[PDB]
Design a binder for this molecule. Structure first.
Ligand code: HEM
Ligand code: HEM
Ligand SMILES: Cc1cc(N)nc(COC[C@@H]2C[C@@H](OCc3cc(C)cc(N)n3)CN2)c1
Ligand SMILES: Cc1cc(N)nc(COC[C@@H]2C[C@@H](OCc3cc(C)cc(N)n3)CN2)c1
Ligand SMILES: C[C@H](O)[C@H](O)[C@H]1CNc2nc(N)[nH]c(=O)c2N1
Ligand SMILES: C[C@H](O)[C@H](O)[C@H]1CNc2nc(N)[nH]c(=O)c2N1
Ligand SMILES: [Zn+2]
Lengths: 411, 407
């Protein structure tokens, strides 16, 4: 079967066949679309099919499908599963798998870059201190003094589900948030619960507005342990504006390295519960969401005040005006400091070129419109006008619940 | 089977039960989401009639009453004999209001119960259609104090006697492909303009020419009529700070009036049912003015602002966008023509959603359409999970008549 998507700006029509390979579910049915819903131990029997599906894809990609090497590898994995109840990936399969999880990530606008991913194999890791060391090396490699490089570090896979490796941080680098007795928040309200956990575990909180959180690291199902990332490894950018000299006195800064640490990587049925990955920022992630969400730093008012916009009625579009100036500031700042960043116009244009390429060479590109369209200036970006099909391919990145909700505390 | 939606800004969680009453299919499956796709006999009619009359009688708290059982009887009888039936005025009004209530793509539904319904089922000719439509335009416009209205022409019979307004909106601007290669006017309307010229319209060949109505009665060939110019309220666009903005020569019309959709009520199909509200400012300033395939004015504006257009990262597009949208709102407000900004409209929709969840058990909403085309995440709807599903009565897309009509 063939599904078509149309671009309503260019009238380019594309044909998807790749969707024939999805099997996981969307949340939607013939009666209800859940496209805007944020969140819509295995057995041997389920495992070998998943392994086989993956190895068939891997061997096809290297043009060795049905070779002796492919067949010997299937037999080898089959025997390993029946005997040990799991299997180990070869390094080449791990690299291919991690790259494909990114390629398959339907909410990711930056996927043009998918084939350029540095994979660090941390499956020999055994302790939280070992995890800390791997993560520092990742951060230093990825940061590359501002010339950012995409990377992923993969810790040992799930076994019985009682021995999981987890990074409790949602990102490797993030700022603390402190709920005050008066109900106000100091720092980032997104990270209050995690900050309280760090404090409880013994972190000495500086109690400022941009305090880089400590890593909380769990190895082999053990209780997690705290570590401070060496400050010299954490690249930060002070935010200033090209024309507005008072912008700097808002005291804003942000970190250069976006590094997701709380997702689960599935490759061939295996589950990598600690797999931190990092790329570089699109400016709106900081300028629109991190700074301007009401539930985050919430700076729109102070910026509009300083700009002397008419704030008595929403129809002056003062919020819209201040929003643009903040985003100019973020891009100007990163560029001035030679820290990699991409604007939402460039990133969405590259994404459309990536998407069209994927259609031609792969037969599709699953994409989640709700997430791909930037949170400002939506229809002046080409993705707004692009119909997309969202479906689930593996290898994949998945949400997993926060570990403080599920961890069995040892003592 | 019972579904939750969460607002990620306020943590408020609502429970949807209304989706179980959903009837038509979404386009999505368990394997694939089509949420971003623009367009994903007798024996059939009585179930549809019954479904509607049950909800109607429930709505006036008379469910299972003799008057309810009598009406079902009467309609059953009428379909049996005539192959169709006719709605009571009370039913027609209820159906139309509810079609708006059910429109998952409409942010303005807080207004749904204040809809003036003009019953034009007694209309028989295109000249009659023109009269009804001028009356709708004048009533809805109300000298700038806009009032929502719908005018309902006779229902489909055998499908060869359809009433249709050929225009996509009652008021729109012509588009002309030029020898030059460019497009003069609105590129959205090039094909319809040609059909108008072909059917005899003498086009002025300007940038903002109000199209004539092309009206089809009783499945007859469509006829042309010009809307009295004095009934078409238009707004010249100026900016509160940039005096040069008026020199761009921009204007828009006050009355957004959709005329190409089909109203389905209790299985009956009303193929000509033009309806109108008032504008949200972004519809004109972001989409009509800035879409690359519409008036595409960003470059010109940015050039007059003297912005650095060298690199996308200066955000010159974003800067010019905000200014254009400021000018749209200021112009409408200064001329006292009703308009809503996207902040006000989306705040109102959140309130409406909470009302509908509390009073009705849900509100079908299409996030892709509801979130405005600029400044998405600074409006509350961005952070609001929504469920999309199809309830009847409904407004539906139907194919353009020139593909379907046999001359
Ligand atoms: C190279 C530069 C990259 C850019 C500019 C980029 C851009 C983005 C943006 C803007 C989002 C949505 C984030 C949000 O709104 O919270 C996102 C999501 C995502 N990206 Fe990327 N990305 C990049 C690299 C990567 C890499 C290296 C990976 C994994 C190897 C990745 C995988 C993902 C995943 C799984 C999501 C969805 C996350 C979720 O559901 O919370 N991306 N990307
Ligand atoms: C009173 C003020 C109203 C406001 C502010 C408003 C707002 C909007 C907006 C902004 C859109 C999206 C339009 C687009 O992006 O092309 C829309 C769509 C829609 N509205 Fe409304 N609306 C109003 C009145 C009405 C009325 C009176 C009806 C019917 C009686 C209606 C039914 C619809 C329908 C069916 C759609 C989707 C049309 C389509 O799919 O193309 N609305 N509304
Ligand atoms: C509950 C829930 C599920 C789910 N899938 N996502 C969320 C919220 O998303 C948090 C976002 C995703 C992460 O950033 C995206 C990103 C990742 C990368 C690798 C690069 C980049 N520029 N941007 C951090 N914030 C919440
Ligand atoms: C009643 C009303 C009020 C208001 N403020 N705005 C509107 C705007 O809707 C008018 C038209 C109808 C919409 O058409 C877009 C469209 C195109 C196609 C091909 C299909 C479809 N369902 N919808 C957008 N403009 C309508
Ligand atoms: C409810 C809704 O799905 C939610 O607010 C989404 C919308 N789109 C998004 N898009 C991106 N890129 N990131 C997000 O966090 C969200 N949040
Ligand atoms: C492909 C995509 O569905 C399309 O561009 C949509 C997105 N959201 C929209 N939203 C509104 N309100 N109006 C539109 O015309 C569109 N177009
Ligand atoms: Zn869907």
């Amino acid at each position: 079967r063939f599904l078509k998507v149309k671009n309503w700006e260019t009238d380019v029509v594309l044909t998807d066949t790749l969707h024939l390979k999805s099997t996981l579910e969307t949340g939607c049915t013939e009666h209800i679309c859940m496209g805007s819903i944020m969140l819509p131990v295995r057995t041997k029997d389920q495992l070998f099919p998943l392994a086989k599906e993956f190895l068939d894809q891997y061997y096809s990609s290297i043009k060795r499908f049905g070779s002796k090497a492919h067949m010997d590898r299937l037999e080898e994995v089959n025997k390993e599963i029946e005997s040990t109840s799991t299997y180990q990936l070869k390094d080449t399969e791990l690299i291919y798998g991690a790259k494909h999880a990114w390629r398959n990530a339907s909410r990711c606008v930056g996927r043009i870059q998918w084939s350029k991913l540095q994979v660090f194999d941390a499956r020999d890791c055994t302790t939280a201190h070992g995890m800390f060391n791997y993560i520092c090396n990742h951060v230093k490699y990825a940061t590359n003094k501002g010339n950012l490089r995409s990377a992923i570090t993969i810790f040992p896979q799930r076994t019985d589900g009682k021995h999981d490796f987890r990074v409790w941080n949602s990102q490797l680098i993030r700022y603390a948030g402190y709920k005050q007795p008066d109900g106000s928040t100091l720092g980032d309200p997104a990270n209050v619960q995690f900050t309280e956990i760090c404090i409880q575990q013994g972190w000495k909180a500086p109690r400022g507005r941009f305090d880089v959180l400590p890593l909380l690291l769990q190895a082999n199902g053990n209780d997690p342990e705290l570590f401070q990332i060496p400050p010299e490894l954490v690249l930060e950018v002070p935010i200033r504006h090209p024309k507005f000299d008072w912008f700097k006195d808002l005291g804003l800064k942000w970190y250069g390295l976006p590094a997701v640490s709380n997702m689960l990587l599935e490759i061939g049925g295996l589950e990598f519960s600690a797999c931190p990955f990092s790329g570089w920022y699109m400016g709106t992630e900081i300028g629109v969401r991190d700074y301007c969400d009401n539930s985050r730093y919430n700076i729109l008012e102070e910026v509009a005040k300083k700009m002397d916009l008419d704030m008595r009625k929403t129809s002056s579009l003062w919020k819209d005006q201040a929003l643009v100036e903040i985003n100019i500031a973020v891009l100007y700042s990163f560029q001035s400091d030679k820290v990699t960043i991409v604007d939402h116009h460039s990133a969405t244009e590259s994404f459309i070129k990536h998407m069209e390429n994927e259609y031609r060479c792969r037969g599709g590109c699953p994409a989640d419109w709700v997430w791909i369209v930037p949170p400002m200036s939506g229809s002046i970006t080409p993705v707004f006008h692009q119909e997309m099909l969202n479906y689930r391919l593996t290898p994949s990145f998945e949400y997993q619940p926060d570990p403080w909700n599920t961890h069995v505390w040892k003592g």
